[PDB]
Amino acid sequence: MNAQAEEFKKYLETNGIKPKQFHKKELIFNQWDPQEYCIFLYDGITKLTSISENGTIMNLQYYKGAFVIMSGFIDTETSVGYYNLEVISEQATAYVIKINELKELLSKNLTHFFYVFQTLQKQVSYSLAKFNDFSINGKLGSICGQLLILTYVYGKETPDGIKITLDNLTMQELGYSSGIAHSSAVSRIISKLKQEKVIVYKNSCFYVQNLDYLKRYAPKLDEWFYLACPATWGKLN
């Protein structure tokens, strides 16, 4: 839980905005029926995806509650882009706010205006950092960068390293995060990381045994976790 997010929850429920329950594989919004929302993901795990005319899947970013995703601009109320927000956890809870009423809610209470503005600053800096590390070292650095992200957010200390508490993280789903189209390619990069004793693919889960190696290929992301998520970062250093 988070303090600012819990007071925001009590603010929405006080104004008539009630929760909605989504189950795994469900889409809160999608790229084909654009509706300008403000998704306040309170509990659950989701991934922001995009599918091209070709049909290639792109895993842009994972979201873990509580956070704020918006599919439309605040002043114009027009689409910011055509993306899908798929629930990947077994169940998730979110507060769907029509883009228009949100304008009023934040106008009344500034404490929650700056909270939404803060998470937005977390998004901007996160995208620049992620874009920085994925671009420099090619696909190896992109797999290493993504595994660094998941290690901080879904990683727990274990005797065999640091286990990633994320189910159904197939080879395809890792490639989609780094723009790899073939599972055989992402698998090749994993084999190299196993031979270098960086990770161990024990029973359909990844165990990170050499965090410093990943920090080598994603310095701006580790820097971001330290500067933006100091609590999540400190629990592994």
Added chain:
Amino acid sequence: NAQAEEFKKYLETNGIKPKQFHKKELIFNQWDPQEYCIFLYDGITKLTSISENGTIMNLQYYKGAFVIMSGFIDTETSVGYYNLEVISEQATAYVIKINELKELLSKNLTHFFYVFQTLQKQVSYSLAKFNDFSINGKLGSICGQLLILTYVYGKETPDGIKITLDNLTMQELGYSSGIAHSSAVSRIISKLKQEKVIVYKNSCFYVQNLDYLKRYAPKLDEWFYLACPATWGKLN
């Protein structure tokens, strides 16, 4: 444009007057990180980062009017260690202390939404750019970056679309796409030259097949339509 003028006159009421910078000058930097809210009013700049081993990265360009946050508003700490270099001859920007920003936005809520909107344009921009640069590797990354420059600094002419950037060397394009060696950028440009996509006149770039770049940057072209519809209409 219009909403930035109201943010100018407003900033010209609370004693935060503009400062002038020249080319090669850094507004803020990564080694001495001061937290400011930059309101680039006029000029062109690039956001860069230098790794520990010296490699340069060009994250994106900024053309006024726009807003660049070097620090958070609640924690008042830094959002990351980046440099904002002026690449135009002259650029005017209003430097706002991060601790002052929170009190200034609470006064007028219409300018709060303005800074909020421009930040959403930043988020959407990064996702689209991240999307297109990842699918097709480096060829797509050069095409995407070229498509960006063609919309923002492009002007139609009898032959091609002139990308009006003084310094657009092969090394500077590679920094935008994560290519370390200029020879690799050239080889890719030689492929685009042979495929009738672009030509190279006076160390200046001309685009003749805009649709070809749209193939490799669908999300970025989608972004200009939704977020900068005026800049999009000039070429469609």
Added chain:
DNA sequence: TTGAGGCATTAACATTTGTTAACGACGATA
């Protein structure tokens, strides 16, 4: 006019990644 340094082009090689396919392990259904 001479000579230095930056930048683009091209080449030739090494490494990585795209692409397709065969093998084998595991789960599920009947």
Added chain:
DNA sequence: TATCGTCGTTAACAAATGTTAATGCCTCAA
């Protein structure tokens, strides 16, 4: 038990990109 489907390896090949170096063009400075 047998048999189909999915997913992970590993291979082999093609294509792209990393990397270095020689070359030619250009501006500058004396």
